[PDB]
Paper text:
[name] is a 46 kDa protein comprising an N-terminal DEP (Dishevelled, Egl-10, and Pleckstrin) domain tandem, herein referred to as DEPt, and a C-terminal PDZ (postsynaptic density 95, disks large, zonula occludens-1) domain. Biochemical analysis and cryo-EM reconstructions of [name] bound to human [name] complex 1 (mTORC1) and mTORC2 reveal that both structured regions of [name], the PDZ domain and the DEP domain tandem (DEPt), are involved in [name] interaction. The PDZ domain binds tightly with mildly activating effect, but then acts as an anchor for DEPt association that allosterically suppresses [name] activation.
[name]-mTORC1 overall refinement (map 4), focused refinement on symmetry-expanded protomer (map 5) and focused refinement on one protomer classified for the DEPt region (map 6) were used for modeling and illustration. (e) Fourier shell correlation (FSC) curves for unmasked, spherical, loose, and tight masks, and corrected FSC curve for the map 5 reconstruction, yielding a gold standard FSC resolution of 3.67 Å. In one step, the [name] PDZ domain binds the [name] FAT domain. The PDZ domain core (aaDEPTOR326–409) adopts a canonical PDZ fold and binds the TRD2 subdomain of the [name] FAT domain. The interaction interface is formed by a conserved surface of the PDZ domain and three [name] helices (aamTOR1525–1578). The canonical PDZ domain peptide binding groove is present, but remains unoccupied in the interaction of the [name] PDZ domain with [name]. Residues aaDEPTOR309–325 provide an N-terminal extension to the PDZ core domain, while aaDEPTOR304–308 bind a groove formed by alpha-helices 14–16 of the [name] FAT domain. Indeed, we observe weak residual density in the [name]-mTORC1 complex at a binding site for helical peptide segments of substrates and the inhibitor PRAS40 on the FRB domain, which might represent a dynamically interacting segment of [name] or copurified interacting proteins. Thus, a secondary linker-mediated, low-affinity binding mode of [name] (or in trans-phosphorylation without recruiting signal) is required and provides a plausible explanation for the residual signal at the FRB domain.
Numbering used by the authors:
A (entry chain A): 17 to 30, 37 to 53, 60 to 74, 82 to 156, 162 to 223, 233 to 246, 258 to 289, 304 to 317, ...
B (entry chain I): 304 to 409
C (entry chain A): 1261 to 1758
Write the structure that this text describes.
Amino acid sequence: XXXXXXXXXXXXXXXXXXXXXXXXXXXXXXXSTRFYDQLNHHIFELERKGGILAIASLIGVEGGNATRIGRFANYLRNLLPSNDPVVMEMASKAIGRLAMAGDTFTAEYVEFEVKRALEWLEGRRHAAVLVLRELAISVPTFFFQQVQPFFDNIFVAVWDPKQAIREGAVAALRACLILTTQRWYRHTFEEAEKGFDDDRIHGALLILNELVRISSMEGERLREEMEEIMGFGTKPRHITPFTXXXXXXXXXXXXXXXXXXXXXXXXXSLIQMTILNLLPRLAAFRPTQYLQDTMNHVLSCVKKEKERTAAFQALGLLSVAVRSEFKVYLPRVLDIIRAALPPKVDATVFTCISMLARIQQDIKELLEPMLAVGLSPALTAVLYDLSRQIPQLKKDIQDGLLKMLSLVLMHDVGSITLALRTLGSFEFELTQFVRHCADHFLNSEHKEIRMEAARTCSRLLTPSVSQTAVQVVADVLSKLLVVGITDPDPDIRYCVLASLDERFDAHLAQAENLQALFVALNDQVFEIRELAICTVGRLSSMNPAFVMPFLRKMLIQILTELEHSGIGRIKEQSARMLGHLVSNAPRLIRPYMEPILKALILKLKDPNPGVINNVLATIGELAQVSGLEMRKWVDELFIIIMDMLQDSSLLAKRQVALWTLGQLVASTGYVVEPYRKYPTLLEVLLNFLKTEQNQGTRREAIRVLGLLGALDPYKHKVNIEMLVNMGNLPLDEFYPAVSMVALMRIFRDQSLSHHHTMVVQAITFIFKSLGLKCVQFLPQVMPTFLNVIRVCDGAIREFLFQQLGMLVSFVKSHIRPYMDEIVTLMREFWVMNTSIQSTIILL
Amino acid sequence: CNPKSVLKRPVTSEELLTPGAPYARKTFTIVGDAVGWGFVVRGSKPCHIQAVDPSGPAAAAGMKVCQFVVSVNGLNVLHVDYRTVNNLILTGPRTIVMEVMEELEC
Amino acid sequence: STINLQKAWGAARRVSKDDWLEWLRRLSLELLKDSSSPSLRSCWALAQAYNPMARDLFNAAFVSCWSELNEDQQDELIRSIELALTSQDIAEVTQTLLNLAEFMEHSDKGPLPLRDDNGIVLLGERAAKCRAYAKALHYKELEFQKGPTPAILESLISINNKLQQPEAAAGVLEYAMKHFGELEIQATWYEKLHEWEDALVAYDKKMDTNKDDPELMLGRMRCLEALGEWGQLHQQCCEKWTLVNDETQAKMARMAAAAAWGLGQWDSMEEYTCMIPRDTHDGAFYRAVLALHQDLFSLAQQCIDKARDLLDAELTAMAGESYSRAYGAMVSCHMLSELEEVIQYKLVPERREIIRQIWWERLQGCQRIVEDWQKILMVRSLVVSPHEDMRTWLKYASLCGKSGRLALAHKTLVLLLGVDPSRQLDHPLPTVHPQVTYAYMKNMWKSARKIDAFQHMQHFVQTMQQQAQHAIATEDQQHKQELHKLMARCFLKLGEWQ
Ligand SMILES: O=P(O)(O)O[C@H]1[C@H](OP(=O)(O)O)[C@@H](OP(=O)(O)O)[C@H](OP(=O)(O)O)[C@@H](OP(=O)(O)O)[C@H]1OP(=O)(O)O
């Protein structure tokens, strides 16, 4: 896009720049090569954030290539030596995305960064640390290639007086020790305890914790879950849609930690933060003297500020680990919580109150301040998971929680968003609210309110005999259908339409709703159109008298757009649409299967990849729906698919090719006989196993070898000189004979076009060294050599005629049989060109 | 000889129900897998765990063979047949909430 | 002209594939440069730019050089050849040097002497890892000629089976019987030869004298499952569980589940399948089977895909070296795709007769080995009792007879008949299912009860011709045509027997 591409480049150079980088990545999803390298170089030299956004995004989507790797490697190698913060971490993310591309140069690029990282071990030191952390996560194998340099250099470099290194290098030690445990430990504990004997505190405590934490995931698994905070009996659809040392040192890991936490209680915020993280995980390994040194730092940090968030997380682990002995410090903790909440940070306080239960009847009184705090996603996630683990009063929980929601929804924008997310996330017990919600969505100009109130109402209509209740549900769903047709914002239209599930099909099958749905089959958005035609097809069993005439009209129109529109996209969309009918309305389509299949075969014999892919996915869906009525056309379909399977030139994906072939063999029941008709079938299907890298595809290539049966080896047999040279001759003759044979092989084909001069010279020297015994080889050499002179071009011609002259001088009288051809050659290739004339006169 | 019995304890009825003494209850939440959970319950009255797949998710989260269960996914199944529990676990969600008696080496 | 050669010999600092490949290229080009015959020396320049030329002249360069060397250089070379094959062997380098050793055997000069005996042991082991089973056999036969040992005979047997030459391996067991007797013949040799009857006799003789051992228990259980004696195989399981370790436990359950499934005891089958490791193909398959027994269709499809995923490794390895080796995997894929067509059979009543016809046509394309058929029929028996499809189990009974396993053939036919004629000798044969009865009589004749068979045939044909006359209406004309086609074959048997 050239001018406009450089215009938006400087626009992204000078939120908005992340939306233009995501749009450039979206433009690279569809998509010259030189202009993209120049545009990347234009953004590089100028700003540095937009340059990293240009490099990393293109490589991931457009795909790593030898050209692109060789060029952009120089750009990445220039940024790392000297750069600003934030831009450095973005450049390190561009390394991780390059290293997970999965190319042949990845082995060189990763080991180039790792070797230079070991040389360093401040924009140099922290850069190498970010490189080692992301490579340890993404690439465990080549990260393990240098482990002895890793530990030795890092235990020196970590204990330098720096903070950014201590944050990352310990996380690199985390990624390394996890790989060591699953598959050094003495060298870790020695260098860590040497460091312990205020910069040399918070690093040693994390190293001792690594031996404790990895040995026992029970401590970490509580923290890992709090940070983040169908059915097996379902019948599948009848038509398949297309698709030791850490335990003997853990005691010393807590003993040398219950002193550091007692000494460095308030020395040099950062150290107190790492102490309050580590202390619970050490106590969860082995809980009283250890508890007293833990409890003094944790309890004192709760009253303080800038730590209250991490303090309760540590306190929640301590409450689970130390069960009975912690009960002494319950009045201290609960008084601080009763003082902390009135001010409304406390989003974590509720998460840890959930982990406290993870109980007594006192909690009943604790509910009246808890709910008075306010609506947060943590609070309602807690009370939901509270009633899961301890369902003593699940009725009283829902009583208070519905009373809270009622007080809220009786009465800014972002809160109403979250209030709807709450109302629609987990189950509840709501008629007036929904008729009032029918007012809010219509009378709200906010896109996010409408989109959430839509998600909420669609979720809250899961309870779906009194006539009045039905008429209410009918009214709301009629209003919803109106929104799904008339709303401008297609996202809101998509959410509403997507939310009209199987659950509502009793209501959607009503006459009025079906007249609406028909209008919806001509929506501007193809995806909504797809979803609407699916719904009407699904209802063709409920009310076929109405639905079947309308799907017939739609079928004719779809097949018209397929056959008569001469456009890739429209035809691709039309096949997809015919797809949704076959799957959702198989009864309707069965009588019309022979017309449809002839139209589709005609499309397969037409001279865009996505069109053929959707046509194949439809034929595959017709197979199952046909129910043995397509046998007559089986032979034609098989030939076409086999022609398309062999070779990679065909645009159509092998995956769907193999999938539709599976569905044909399966439904129609063509077994054993196809093997006889097409004997290369077993050679094609055993070639995919040696070529394909995709799992899904390899699975299909197996599933098709399954359905076709296991052929008897004999039935497959029905369906389908150098040593000899030496066996005869003496060695002095053998050596010319094998040399000649080896030269003759290269002679033929286009291999000679590369090794022309070399091959010809060797043959001449052989004949000269032999003498008149070369006459033997004449019938081999001459016919080829003459045909080489005929099809050779340019400079080589002259050289060949020179060497033919040598040949003729050696062969002498024996050249008589081939002389006539040589003259013809000369006659044809004699020109007024001075060069060839002197050559031919010599010949 | 067709059935197999691996439980040394002949009967545990009226012994589990009494609070305290031989065992300490624990709740083990097991997540489903692509090929199944990997546990079998074959206790007539107490529904003791028959076998556990050593490489399965259940063995990773404790779930030793010599255990007894009384509640599954909330519903209390302390006094039902083993086959009935097998129906409940299959008809239930992919993730199963299970309580293990977990006798303390006694 | 032996300085660069001795560097290329005594380097051995190569820690990858392309490093040894580079050693090869440097070695070949140095041999061409050296080569006394100028017709080869002239090709050195071409061999540099183009690799195929260097490899085609490899054997001729070598012989030319190796003849010139004055013994001392040959030892320097031979020592380096030994090290290259023995240590850091690379498939591509190996099969080059094997083709060199073979070329040297055909030469007048004679085979290169490596580590004594001309490396008859080394080159055999190397060809075996190269999967050059014909070279392996030749070398293992040279070793046998020098001396006969039990180890040699064992390896000879395994080589023959890999080469799809069953008769030769059987001949090796006949040699063992004569010259070594019986003690030297292990039961595993019968197991490899598919002599399941003699292997069971061997494992019984061994388990009587020697105290019971994990190895001899699994060997005898493996024989019982191959024979299909599910009664005895399930008895050995139930007796020995607590007596067994967890390592043998994992090698037990794959056979114990097969036995439980055969007997139809689904509670036992669930216990056993959990003990099978999930990483195995069979572990996935048997979990997918207990899915379809409990109607867990969603989980079944999941387990089948993992089963296919684990069959990836097997299918690829077998397909690499001939279709015949790949047949075992092909049968695994047969059973997987049949389990997919049991889900359809349990969901679509309209599809039932189509599925049966497909099943019948598929089984006839498959090879007539009784093990493979038993596997496939056991799968289909998940939703089709033998009475609902007679012709499948009759053709099966036919194979059992012609393969010299009349005991299994008898059991199969008794199960189809409905009762035991063997017990009630005085009673007449039941006339319901006449095609079954006829198959039973022609089995009885093969069992050398040929006076009794003849008498039964006379009774049967009198019954048939009376059952025809009285039941001939216009309606049953296709039935009448099948009843005449039977009676005709009965009359022919009567004659030949008389
Ligand atoms: O083994 P035989 O006593 O000679 O019997 C054969 C044999 O039948 P079985 O299936 O019982 O072995 C043939 O089957 P194949 O094993 O060769 O496949 C069968 O032929 P078909 O498979 O074509 O039915 C043939 O039957 P027919 O005489 O109708 O050709 C039948 O002969 P008898 O029934 O006369 O013994």
